[PDB]
């Protein structure tokens, strides 16, 4: 029937419940965080129970893990008092939040957070060989613990740490096909090898294929040995260690040759999937690599209202159409496109940690 997510403190005393692991950014706004929390025996009566929602840029290891953490920027923190409750604010507990409130104790209390759109989206990198940089990325952590006030905490033992995803969704806007790409190469004379390509649309979702349309007008004297069609990711760190991963995440090729004084045309179907990549290399994900539900990081959006450095990493995509050339020298074009997170997509407790 219905599915709900739980993680409980190491001591098992405190537990958190939630309807969504992933929260969508709609540009316009963001799914809300509507959860509940359960601290059974008396903790501490004198001691209040809190919930924290933090969003930070980390560089050096992952996981806001102290050891190796070279740099960290807070981008947003929220608290508010679960128990006791508080006059605040839009308290109307989602239907789910209600059914949950009676399935459990009288000491299950609601809790909610509302997250600004302008914030970056969950994203994660970890360099290859290496590429000298350390790992980094943006995180959305939810902490939940007790203590008499906020300026006193406790190592995880009596708290609960868990991390949510903010995935970026965006609508298919009408408009021109990913600007075709034109280009002429004169290789030694006045006779041109002309290349021309296009995409069916400007925006794609995770899974969606793309249909690269390619037209070659080869009046040249050389020969096109092959035609390699790929998708490249471009990820630029904007905090602390400026750096720039470029990397193909999909790659198609056939036995396609084009003769001098010929003409050739064809449509390639290409699909960019994190799942089709063995080596992460310096790739930009939307969550931990090990997790099945992880995808290539979504294009980062034109940027709403906060802007700047403060997006941490800066993911972006391109199709590349390249013509390998016999007597040498290779002709190409690049078509930029945006890749968003899909959304044309009896309570049962399922373990939160993926």
Swiss-Prot record:
Changing residue 246 to Q: Abolishes phosphoinositide binding and ADRB2 internalization. It holds the Pfam family Arrestin_N. GO terms for cellular component: clathrin-coated pit; cytoplasm; endocytic vesicle; nucleus; plasma membrane. The lineage of its organism: Eukaryota, Metazoa, Chordata, Craniata, Vertebrata. The [DE]-X(1,2)-F-X-X-[FL]-X-X-X-R motif mediates interaction the AP-2 complex subunit AP2B1. A motif ([DE]-X(1,2)-F-X-X-[FL]-X-X-X-R motif) lies at residues 346-354. Belongs to the arrestin family. Keywords: Cell membrane, Coated pit, Cytoplasm, Cytoplasmic vesicle, Hydroxylation, Membrane, Nucleus, Phosphoprotein, Protein transport, Signal transduction inhibitor, Transport, Ubl conjugation. Its main location: cytoplasm. SMART domains: Arrestin_C. Homooligomer; the self-association is mediated by InsP6-binding. Heterooligomer with ARRB1; the association is mediated by InsP6-binding. Interacts with ADRB2 and CHRM2. Interacts with PDE4A. Interacts with PDE4D. Interacts with MAPK10, MAPK1 and MAPK3. Interacts with DRD2. Interacts with FSHR. Interacts with CLTC. Interacts with HTR2C. Interacts with CRR5. Interacts with CXCR4. Interacts with SRC. Interacts with DUSP16; the interaction is interrupted by stimulation of AGTR1 and activation of MAPK10. Interacts with CHUK; the interaction is enhanced stimulation of ADRB2. Interacts with RELA. The modification Phosphotyrosine is found at residue 43. This is Beta-arrestin-2. Residues 235-354 are annotated as: Interaction with TRAF6. It comes from the Eukaryota. Functions in regulating agonist-mediated G-protein coupled receptor (GPCR) signaling by mediating both receptor desensitization and resensitization processes. During homologous desensitization, beta-arrestins bind to the GPRK-phosphorylated receptor and sterically preclude its coupling to the cognate G-protein; the binding appears to require additional receptor determinants exposed only in the active receptor conformation. GO terms for molecular function: angiotensin receptor binding; inositol hexakisphosphate binding; phosphatidylinositol binding; phosphatidylinositol-3,4,5-trisphosphate binding. InterPro entries: Arrestin, Arrestin-like_C, Arrestin-like_N, Arrestin_C-like, Arrestin_CS, Arrestin_N, Ig_E-set. It is found in: Cytoplasm; Nucleus; Cell membrane; Membrane, Clathrin-coated pit.
